[PDB]
């Protein structure tokens, strides 16, 4: 039940 | 001019992987090498469909790395799984040890993270010397540069199964729960939607990590 990636750091 | 039959261990006729414009990688054959301008270009005929002229950072060998030959920062292609498998580029973030259960941690070019086995990754043939410099997403490029250069200094938070924290995702801080710890990753359940994400335990998307990094004296 995967969420799409949010990457490695918070959104700028 | 500048046609070559070989460039070191790259030989016309070898099996190879090439990067397509979709950012997925596909098996083919190296059909030509040519010196153009400042370097070499590599012509790949794909098994399924198409031909491409590629730079050396956009081809990978069709074999799996021997034990112990990759390093933190190595540029690789790795299996990405959704239900379906695709090959996507990334960077080695951790090499096999028992506590990661002898897997490689991969930070993919889009910021996704996963552990993969030795038989799930392929080495890129001619990476850039600073391997992150061909990462298109500037926020992932910057993160990788910081991570690789600081390694092995990796501040992480200790999280336990069942712990409740806020986790950032796309600009919002969401109520979330720690489901599982696996080496340097934590499986976070976002409570609003009940979907999970594996996140690096040193990521400032995890509020305890954000809090620690933001503090200062
Ligand atoms: Na260093």
Numbering used by the authors:
A (entry chain B): 7 to 18
B (entry chain A): 189 to 271, 273 to 406
Publication text:
SETDB1 (also known as ESET or KMT1E) is a histone H3K9 methyltransferase that generates H3K9me3 in euchromatic regions. SETDB1 contains three Tudor domains (3TD) and a methyl-CpG binding domain (MBD) in its N-terminal part, followed by a split SET domain, which harbors the catalytic center for H3K9 methylation.
The three Tudor domains compose a stack, in which the individual domains interact with each other face-to-back. The specificity of the H3 peptide interaction is determined mainly through (1) recognition of K14ac by an acetyl-lysine binding groove between TD2 and TD3, (2) recognition of K9me2 by an aromatic cage in TD3, and (3) binding of G12 and G13 to a narrow groove between TD2 and TD3. The acetyl group forms two hydrogen bonds with the backbone carbonyl-oxygen of G300 and the backbone amine of Y389.
